[PDB]
Design a protein around this ligand. Sequence first.
Ligand SMILES: *[C@@H]1O[C@H](CO)[C@@H](O[C@@H]2O[C@H](CO)[C@@H](O[C@@H]3O[C@H](CO[C@H]4O[C@H](CO)[C@@H](O)[C@H](O)[C@@H]4O)[C@@H](O)[C@H](O[C@H]4O[C@H](CO)[C@@H](O)[C@H](O)[C@@H]4O)[C@@H]3O)[C@H](O)[C@H]2NC(C)=O)[C@H](O)[C@H]1NC(C)=O
Ligand SMILES: *[C@@H]1O[C@H](CO)[C@@H](O[C@@H]2O[C@H](CO)[C@@H](O[C@@H]3O[C@H](CO[C@H]4O[C@H](CO)[C@@H](O)[C@H](O)[C@@H]4O)[C@@H](O)[C@H](O[C@H]4O[C@H](CO)[C@@H](O)[C@H](O)[C@@H]4O)[C@@H]3O)[C@H](O)[C@H]2NC(C)=O)[C@H](O)[C@H]1NC(C)=O
Ligand SMILES: *[C@@H]1O[C@H](CO)[C@@H](O[C@@H]2O[C@H](CO)[C@@H](O[C@@H]3O[C@H](CO[C@H]4O[C@H](CO)[C@@H](O)[C@H](O)[C@@H]4O)[C@@H](O)[C@H](O[C@H]4O[C@H](CO)[C@@H](O)[C@H](O)[C@@H]4O)[C@@H]3O)[C@H](O)[C@H]2NC(C)=O)[C@H](O)[C@H]1NC(C)=O
Ligand SMILES: *[C@@H]1O[C@H](CO)[C@@H](O[C@@H]2O[C@H](CO)[C@@H](O[C@@H]3O[C@H](CO[C@H]4O[C@H](CO)[C@@H](O)[C@H](O)[C@@H]4O)[C@@H](O)[C@H](O[C@H]4O[C@H](CO)[C@@H](O)[C@H](O)[C@@H]4O)[C@@H]3O)[C@H](O)[C@H]2NC(C)=O)[C@H](O)[C@H]1NC(C)=O
Ligand SMILES: CC(=O)N[C@H]1[C@H]([C@H](O)[C@H](O)CO)O[C@@](O)(C(=O)O)C[C@@H]1O
Ligand SMILES: CC(=O)N[C@H]1[C@H]([C@H](O)[C@H](O)CO)O[C@@](O)(C(=O)O)C[C@@H]1O
Ligand SMILES: CC(=O)N[C@H]1[C@H]([C@H](O)[C@H](O)CO)O[C@@](O)(C(=O)O)C[C@@H]1O
Ligand SMILES: CC(=O)N[C@H]1[C@H]([C@H](O)[C@H](O)CO)O[C@@](O)(C(=O)O)C[C@@H]1O
Ligand SMILES: *[C@@H]1O[C@H](CO)[C@@H](O)[C@H](O)[C@H]1NC(C)=O
Ligand SMILES: *[C@@H]1O[C@H](CO)[C@@H](O)[C@H](O)[C@H]1NC(C)=O
Ligand SMILES: *[C@@H]1O[C@H](CO)[C@@H](O)[C@H](O)[C@H]1NC(C)=O
Ligand SMILES: *[C@@H]1O[C@H](CO)[C@@H](O)[C@H](O)[C@H]1NC(C)=O
Ligand SMILES: *[C@@H]1O[C@H](CO)[C@@H](O)[C@H](O)[C@H]1NC(C)=O
Ligand SMILES: *[C@@H]1O[C@H](CO)[C@@H](O)[C@H](O)[C@H]1NC(C)=O
Ligand SMILES: *[C@@H]1O[C@H](CO)[C@@H](O)[C@H](O)[C@H]1NC(C)=O
Ligand SMILES: *[C@@H]1O[C@H](CO)[C@@H](O)[C@H](O)[C@H]1NC(C)=O
Ligand SMILES: *[C@@H]1O[C@H](CO)[C@@H](O)[C@H](O)[C@H]1NC(C)=O
Ligand SMILES: *[C@@H]1O[C@H](CO)[C@@H](O)[C@H](O)[C@H]1NC(C)=O
Ligand SMILES: *[C@@H]1O[C@H](CO)[C@@H](O)[C@H](O)[C@H]1NC(C)=O
Ligand SMILES: [Ca+2]
Ligand SMILES: [Ca+2]
Ligand SMILES: [Ca+2]
Ligand SMILES: [Ca+2]
Ligand SMILES: [Ca+2]
Ligand SMILES: [Ca+2]
Ligand SMILES: [Ca+2]
Ligand SMILES: [Ca+2]
Lengths: 388, 388, 388, 388
Amino acid sequence: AEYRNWSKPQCDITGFAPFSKDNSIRLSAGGDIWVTREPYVSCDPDKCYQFALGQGTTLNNVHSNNTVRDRTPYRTLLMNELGVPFHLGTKQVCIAWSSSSCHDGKAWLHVCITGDDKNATASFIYNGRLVDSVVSWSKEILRTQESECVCINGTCTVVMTDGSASGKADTKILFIEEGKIVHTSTLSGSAQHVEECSCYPRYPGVRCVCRDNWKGSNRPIVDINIKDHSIVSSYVCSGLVGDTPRKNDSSSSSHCLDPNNEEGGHGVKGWAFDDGNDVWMGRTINETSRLGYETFKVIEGWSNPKSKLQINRQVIVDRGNRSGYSGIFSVEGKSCINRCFYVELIRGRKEETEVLWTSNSIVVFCGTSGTYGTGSWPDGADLNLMPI
Amino acid sequence: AEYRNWSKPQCDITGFAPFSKDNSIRLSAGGDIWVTREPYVSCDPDKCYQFALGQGTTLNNVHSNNTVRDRTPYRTLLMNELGVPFHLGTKQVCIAWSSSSCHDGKAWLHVCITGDDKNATASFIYNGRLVDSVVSWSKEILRTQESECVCINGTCTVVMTDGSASGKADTKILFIEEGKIVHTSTLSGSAQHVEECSCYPRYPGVRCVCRDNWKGSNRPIVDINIKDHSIVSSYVCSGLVGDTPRKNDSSSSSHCLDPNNEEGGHGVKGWAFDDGNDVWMGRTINETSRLGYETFKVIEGWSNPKSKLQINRQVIVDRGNRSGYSGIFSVEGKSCINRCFYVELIRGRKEETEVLWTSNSIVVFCGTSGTYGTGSWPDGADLNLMPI
Amino acid sequence: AEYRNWSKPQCDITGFAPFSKDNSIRLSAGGDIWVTREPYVSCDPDKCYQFALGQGTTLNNVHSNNTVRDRTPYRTLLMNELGVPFHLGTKQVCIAWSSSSCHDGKAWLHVCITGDDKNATASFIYNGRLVDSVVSWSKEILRTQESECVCINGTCTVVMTDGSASGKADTKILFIEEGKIVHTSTLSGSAQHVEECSCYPRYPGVRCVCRDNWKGSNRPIVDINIKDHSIVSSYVCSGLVGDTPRKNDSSSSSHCLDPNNEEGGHGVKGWAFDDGNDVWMGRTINETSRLGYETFKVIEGWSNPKSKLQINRQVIVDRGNRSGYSGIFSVEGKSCINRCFYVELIRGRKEETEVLWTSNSIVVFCGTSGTYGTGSWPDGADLNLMPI
Amino acid sequence: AEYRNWSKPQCDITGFAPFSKDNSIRLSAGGDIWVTREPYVSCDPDKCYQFALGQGTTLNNVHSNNTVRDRTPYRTLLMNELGVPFHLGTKQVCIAWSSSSCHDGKAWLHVCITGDDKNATASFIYNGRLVDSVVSWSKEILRTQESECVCINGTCTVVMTDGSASGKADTKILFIEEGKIVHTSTLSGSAQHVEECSCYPRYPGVRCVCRDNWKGSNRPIVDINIKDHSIVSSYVCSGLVGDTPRKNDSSSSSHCLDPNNEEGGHGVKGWAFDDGNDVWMGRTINETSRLGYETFKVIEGWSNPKSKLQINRQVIVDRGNRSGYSGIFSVEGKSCINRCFYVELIRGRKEETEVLWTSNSIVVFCGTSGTYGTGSWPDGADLNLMPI
Ligand SMILES: *[C@@H]1O[C@H](CO)[C@@H](O[C@@H]2O[C@H](CO)[C@@H](O[C@@H]3O[C@H](CO[C@H]4O[C@H](CO)[C@@H](O)[C@H](O)[C@@H]4O)[C@@H](O)[C@H](O[C@H]4O[C@H](CO)[C@@H](O)[C@H](O)[C@@H]4O)[C@@H]3O)[C@H](O)[C@H]2NC(C)=O)[C@H](O)[C@H]1NC(C)=O
Ligand SMILES: *[C@@H]1O[C@H](CO)[C@@H](O[C@@H]2O[C@H](CO)[C@@H](O[C@@H]3O[C@H](CO[C@H]4O[C@H](CO)[C@@H](O)[C@H](O)[C@@H]4O)[C@@H](O)[C@H](O[C@H]4O[C@H](CO)[C@@H](O)[C@H](O)[C@@H]4O)[C@@H]3O)[C@H](O)[C@H]2NC(C)=O)[C@H](O)[C@H]1NC(C)=O
Ligand SMILES: *[C@@H]1O[C@H](CO)[C@@H](O[C@@H]2O[C@H](CO)[C@@H](O[C@@H]3O[C@H](CO[C@H]4O[C@H](CO)[C@@H](O)[C@H](O)[C@@H]4O)[C@@H](O)[C@H](O[C@H]4O[C@H](CO)[C@@H](O)[C@H](O)[C@@H]4O)[C@@H]3O)[C@H](O)[C@H]2NC(C)=O)[C@H](O)[C@H]1NC(C)=O
Ligand SMILES: *[C@@H]1O[C@H](CO)[C@@H](O[C@@H]2O[C@H](CO)[C@@H](O[C@@H]3O[C@H](CO[C@H]4O[C@H](CO)[C@@H](O)[C@H](O)[C@@H]4O)[C@@H](O)[C@H](O[C@H]4O[C@H](CO)[C@@H](O)[C@H](O)[C@@H]4O)[C@@H]3O)[C@H](O)[C@H]2NC(C)=O)[C@H](O)[C@H]1NC(C)=O
Ligand SMILES: CC(=O)N[C@H]1[C@H]([C@H](O)[C@H](O)CO)O[C@@](O)(C(=O)O)C[C@@H]1O
Ligand SMILES: CC(=O)N[C@H]1[C@H]([C@H](O)[C@H](O)CO)O[C@@](O)(C(=O)O)C[C@@H]1O
Ligand SMILES: CC(=O)N[C@H]1[C@H]([C@H](O)[C@H](O)CO)O[C@@](O)(C(=O)O)C[C@@H]1O
Ligand SMILES: CC(=O)N[C@H]1[C@H]([C@H](O)[C@H](O)CO)O[C@@](O)(C(=O)O)C[C@@H]1O
Ligand SMILES: *[C@@H]1O[C@H](CO)[C@@H](O)[C@H](O)[C@H]1NC(C)=O
Ligand SMILES: *[C@@H]1O[C@H](CO)[C@@H](O)[C@H](O)[C@H]1NC(C)=O
Ligand SMILES: *[C@@H]1O[C@H](CO)[C@@H](O)[C@H](O)[C@H]1NC(C)=O
Ligand SMILES: *[C@@H]1O[C@H](CO)[C@@H](O)[C@H](O)[C@H]1NC(C)=O
Ligand SMILES: *[C@@H]1O[C@H](CO)[C@@H](O)[C@H](O)[C@H]1NC(C)=O
Ligand SMILES: *[C@@H]1O[C@H](CO)[C@@H](O)[C@H](O)[C@H]1NC(C)=O
Ligand SMILES: *[C@@H]1O[C@H](CO)[C@@H](O)[C@H](O)[C@H]1NC(C)=O
Ligand SMILES: *[C@@H]1O[C@H](CO)[C@@H](O)[C@H](O)[C@H]1NC(C)=O
Ligand SMILES: *[C@@H]1O[C@H](CO)[C@@H](O)[C@H](O)[C@H]1NC(C)=O
Ligand SMILES: *[C@@H]1O[C@H](CO)[C@@H](O)[C@H](O)[C@H]1NC(C)=O
Ligand SMILES: *[C@@H]1O[C@H](CO)[C@@H](O)[C@H](O)[C@H]1NC(C)=O
Ligand SMILES: [Ca+2]
Ligand SMILES: [Ca+2]
Ligand SMILES: [Ca+2]
Ligand SMILES: [Ca+2]
Ligand SMILES: [Ca+2]
Ligand SMILES: [Ca+2]
Ligand SMILES: [Ca+2]
Ligand SMILES: [Ca+2]
């Protein structure tokens, strides 16, 4: 067993093909399924796994009431093989109301964060054992990616944030080798607010596309150099923007270096990646809320902040159905690295009031150099019928 | 680990011995079992698995209502080891309302089809990753085998159909090597309508026995040449015919080259295989509907369309109990290749109205060169008692 | 991986120590557990498994009504690792209302019998595939061991019976090599009626201690020679006898060669093994019915039909609690072969009428050359409270 | 696969980071979870497992009533990978109302005790088979560690106690090699009462920190020499004491050699370990009962019975929430041996009367040479809502 290097060029993408769907919430109307959120997908050399943060409870269960909250002591990182819904035999791999996970080609890394809001602890677990931890540095909700970290030659990188949600915060980028925090670089460059990055291996380094919760509706970009720990940062040029909330297609604008100050308060976790000078990206179809989900390629979208020339649109979830967080993950094909993505289908409170709980199901698509058609893959649960 | 070649002669068959039964529906009266259909069985070099398409729901569950439908976004290919009923820890290995699966002796292939009726996508997943996809070519319900594909020397073949259900349609035969669609041959020969093939390794090529939904009640045969991609096609000569609906034993007839225009509208998935100039085949005992299931050998049945000389009958399911889809699968013994088959035991709507759902259990028999007796292995569930 | 030979002397036994208990029925009052009977335990080179025959249903489930019956089409051989109760993820490894299983040191053998009473089929499954089958030869309930078969140098032996339950029947001993029935020897010697043998590896052959349902209350012994297929048979000399029903300790008697004609009608599956000229054996404490369970060593019990000198008694289940079938199984220690045994704890109909079902839990003890004390390990379920 | 030696120095500890939480009881309000107690955590070379003693029942289940009792025939040692809550597919690895488990780097050892109070049997299971057993020697509740044993060079040591709960009892230390009891040393030294030791590998021997149920509120220490079987014993010097009940921080005192006769009746299982001349230790925050849980380092606490100078306090469970048993376990890092600990969160009778049952959930922390913050990780179940 050797360390992953990801030293392959990126596969040709013409769009995305269906990969996986757990129908979690549909199943939880007759069956004992976890109540969860902030899910993600990472894979080892052999196969793929689905992670989410649990609420220390199942759905048909009295403790599902008020699971609209983001941080409780009862939240754990859940881990199943992709396709297995989160049943009672699901492994809680750590305590976490915030996490990131990745395989370096030998073993698993989990970055797990739990504890008081003003004094969170984050634990680094490698190969089934605790190897390190770190305190919250700025004592205001130390949090991280809510999707996969990335490892290269057995140095793993993760991006974490401690500080304000709607002002300046303190973002750091850790380098972890066999569970051991070996360097901490601090956030540098033109990125102003940075959360919940969706990172991927762009050999010989790592690239993330994040969430600015403060002044931007364009997504931040952070570039991690694995060998020398240097950091550069910016935003996704593309005049069509991926955060939510945002302005409309005609009224929106962006900058390659700055927040665009366009509805920038708040955000949603999301992803994009480059392709020469083009950008592939998903986002919620609806501009103000987490409804629907779409993907497309912005031509010149990576290097030109004026371009709003989208091609290869795909409706992942239709505009009248509920969506949420999404993030990248990358799978080594035989010649090249594929890029894929998951979509959190949030059901329940506060937006839907027919029940007392908040939970999700997931959907997953992978890059394809072949061809594809159309559809919609919503949650599919009937909340009017659900465990009353 | 080496590629399967199947370069062994076919085992002597004198009939079939019991192999497996999941009692799925009986179990779902006290327990959380998937609602499913269009099931099948394929095996790796070591052991066997049971696949079916799910309805994104369990049985005792409000979302089981109206699962009589064939295509929803919530359907996934389920996969367990043979014998394990489809419980909540069951792996949904892809999104699919139509699928085929096979092992090449190194890894798994899944051919998974989902999306809009008029624009379906089909995804090719090998060794835990998406390697290819293709659009529906004729924009009318691109669909496939609903049983195992076949691989030889690590080229896998699958047969798909896009087009009319009760007229001419467009049938293709894909060649897939490590998940990668490497050739597409188009349907050629005297076969007129072709769906849901039950294929098997007849070294050095592949043979399928299909369903003609249009003008035939005899089953079509398609012969895939793996090395040169050439296709030939026809029908099962045997004057005793395997599709359902059909005419009776005295009134029926067949042709080696053409549909017989005998009740040919509609069909049911089914299987047959050759044995010198004889044909082994199963079918529903009842001629117009999916009740009972039987097997027999038609003497001269492979090469003589006038012969109705059956020997070695076996009642798999008695005529007063419900049956359905069946298909072949092949298992490498030590000296030879065995042929086996599964039978879908459909319960529920529309035919049975004591409940709101449609689901199945399965039964499985394997070829034997030994001896056997008699019985019946129906579903065994009491719908009058079932989750009301 | 090499073939088991069992070419080690038998471990010193001074009695038995607790090994395993599944509390199956207690668990089935809040949880979905299989309804089962005729259970057993066999182990591979590494670890042990618990088998039973299912009723195609769980306990809290409408199909549990009338599971007092012995042969339905819905019965399957269940297989879990020892300690795991029979939950919904339990593998049904074949169709069977009668079975035997054993590992030859490379793979699993299952001998599975199902079908019409007057025409049963028995299927031989090795290494995940059907390799052979045989018809019922005398068309009256072909049945077998309901405990582990035994393999030596990769020839496996199993004993089967077709014929009368309360008169002469036809007993055969099959030799199976890699799933393939390679010889059939027929029952020879002074044994008159022979069923449900508990066999074990007494190198260089195999020994069984059976159930005579006709004229004996002493258990039959059958000696299988693996290399030359010759058979000899008799009864357990010991003046203290192991079948149930039987006469009392003072009124009982036995013969080394013949049934003792003492309450001999009926029986119960049970076990014994030799130790120089002594016999270790378990039996129901109660003489007429399946209540309590005990073990002891009869001094001179193996070769002397007049001896009723028991030592080293142990109450496995107390006399006021329900017991049932028991059988041997053998585990290779490092220097020697241990002998162990399981006990079926039957609850329900017909004997207990507070419920509608019939099911069991199990308890397991293993030989010890160390020391031990006392207790009782009954089922422990409250039928007055159970799923009404 | 080689024998564990643990021949590494002990990792630097600055305190403890979160590791694991099963939310067992929260899950059991909608789902079938075991009712359990006296849990623990041990790990093989690769990964960690959570053990507890079951009550032969689930929570929502009629047999959960009166599970306040410590010894029934229906109790088994449960074993899952750490993080998996005790669901119906959980392996009961032996019969036990008292147990200890450990891996020697090749296979598992379980020391399992069950049977009559006045004649208990204890079974030694190694590598999936019974290798030895021993009777209770003093016929008064032979019991053991309720946490992991320790093995070095493939000799495993376990400490057991038979005798009085509130007076002199008979404590022994067994040496077990491949399941085989190879030596028994008897308790020697100044320790007066000794139960439920939390042992760990302090190369070249083993150290335990126990529970004195009689005259001490300071914890006993027992030092096992693996090569020569010699035993020495004493108490934890530290003027801040770890048993419960006890006196307060100002009123308490201790001795390095004797019980302190301070509220010494009763106890609770607990742990401590050394660090030069300092002691790390956890205990219940509340002095008289099992509420809250805390950890700290007593400076000079290992060798100085007058020192009450605590540093590096951490609240594991807050003082208004329920705690219970805790014990050490040790994980081999790459350079050094980490020390971790679990905490039993007991809910139910007798202390809480809103339900009829007694059960637990667990929480687990591991040593860290990094940094950490604060929180509380209580059970989190609402007994006022629980399965009525
Ligand atoms: C079966 O399946 C396929 C795959 O999903 C569908 O084909 C895709 O259709 C979509 C939707 O039209 C295409 O995405 C769109 O591309 C447009 C490009 O405009 C033209 O200009 C270029 C010049 O380079 C031409 O090459 C090209 O042929 C186009 O004619 C964009 O302008 C679109 O964006 C706009 O449309 C949507 C509204 O739908 C708005 O929401 C946007 O804001 C914006 O105004 C869009 O991105 C996609 O490229 C096609 N894919 C492929 C691979 O060809 C089929 O349509 C589908 N069939 C059926 C019946 O459903
Ligand atoms: C115990 O188990 C075995 C195995 O299942 C049964 O034996 C089988 O019995 C079936 C049913 O009769 C046999 O299948 C039939 O074969 C007939 C052959 O006709 C004769 O001619 C040949 C000449 O070559 C002779 O060799 C042979 O002995 C026959 O006498 C077919 O004509 C049958 O088809 C017709 O029968 C059925 C009605 O049952 C109709 O539905 C058909 O449409 C058609 O009219 C049939 O195929 C089978 O061959 C036997 N198997 C074996 C291996 O010998 C036993 O019968 C069973 N015992 C009991 C008591 O149930
Ligand atoms: C703690 O645990 C141990 C192990 O279970 C118990 O010790 C066992 O006790 C049983 C029950 O008495 C013993 O089994 C009995 O052996 C008797 C032998 O008789 C004597 O003669 C021999 C001469 O060779 C002496 O060596 C020996 O010491 C005996 O004194 C049999 O006669 C018994 O059979 C009769 O008793 C039972 C009634 O209990 C009847 O049901 C029978 O039908 C029959 O009449 C019996 O088999 C066993 O040998 C002991 N085992 C060991 C290893 O020593 C302890 O008793 C137990 N302690 C407590 C307090 O429960
Ligand atoms: C964020 O997270 C960290 C880690 O949990 C917290 O820092 C820890 O705080 C605790 C609680 O105060 C510290 O533990 C305490 O240490 C005291 C040492 O006293 C002083 O003297 C030494 C001299 O060597 C100085 O080095 C040191 O700075 C101290 O000022 C003990 O006296 C304490 O024991 C007493 O306090 C508690 C009450 O809380 C009583 O229950 C005891 O009985 C006793 O009277 C205590 O042990 C710990 O050392 C700190 N850890 C680290 C790594 O620095 C932060 O406080 C937290 N931040 C927030 C806002 O919550
Ligand atoms: C660690 C944590 O609490 N993460 C939470 C974040 C933060 O609130 C923002 O990132 C603030 O910066 O976002 C959510 O509220 C959201 O948008 O769905 C949910 C998520 O649980
Ligand atoms: C992809 C798809 O919809 N397959 C369906 C087919 C098609 O309707 C026919 O093959 C039309 O050609 O058959 C069924 O209706 C049937 O007969 O049970 C069910 C199955 O789901
Ligand atoms: C194959 C079969 O039916 N086996 C059954 C046997 C037979 O009735 C006798 O062995 C008749 O010879 O015994 C039982 O009735 C019994 O005693 O509990 C149950 C078991 O299911
Ligand atoms: C084997 C056994 O019964 N162990 C029990 C011990 C003993 O009672 C004491 O150690 C007496 O010495 O402690 C408990 O009561 C307790 O404190 O929670 C529970 C545990 O089940
Ligand atoms: C659910 O939680 C809310 C928030 O605490 C509370 O007001 C309400 O009473 C709860 N309702 C039920 C039915 O549990
Ligand atoms: C990975 O890192 C090691 C450091 O020891 C180095 O020797 C090796 O050459 C590196 N490999 C690549 C492919 O960069
Ligand atoms: C976006 O979501 C809100 C949900 O309340 C809805 O009212 C609004 O119409 C949606 N907007 C668009 C443009 O679809
Ligand atoms: C079931 O579905 C049908 C079809 O939509 C609908 O008319 C009916 O109301 C549903 N019934 C129930 C009880 O859910
Ligand atoms: C299988 O295909 C490869 C192509 O590289 C060929 O070299 C090999 O000989 C083939 N094997 C057989 C048995 O046909
Ligand atoms: C076939 O099935 C239908 C079901 O409605 C039944 O009415 C008919 O009698 C059956 N025919 C035969 C020949 O068994
Ligand atoms: C149970 O089965 C018996 C035997 O057929 C039948 O008479 C009875 O009505 C059944 N009772 C219930 C409640 O299902
Ligand atoms: C087992 O059987 C084989 C037959 O090929 C023989 O060669 C071998 O010596 C036998 N081994 C033993 C230990 O009897
Ligand atoms: C044996 O069992 C029956 C059960 O009905 C009971 O009535 C009888 O008293 C028992 N006999 C003995 C000797 O324990
Ligand atoms: C629970 O157990 C107690 C103790 O035996 C008993 O008195 C009580 O009746 C039981 N209650 C219920 C509801 O089962
Ligand atoms: C300890 O626990 C008991 C529980 O009844 C409580 O009444 C008491 O106040 C607690 N004491 C302290 C010092 O927290
Ligand atoms: Ca349930
Ligand atoms: Ca924003
Ligand atoms: Ca349920
Ligand atoms: Ca047709
Ligand atoms: Ca249930
Ligand atoms: Ca008898
Ligand atoms: Ca339930
Ligand atoms: Ca004490």
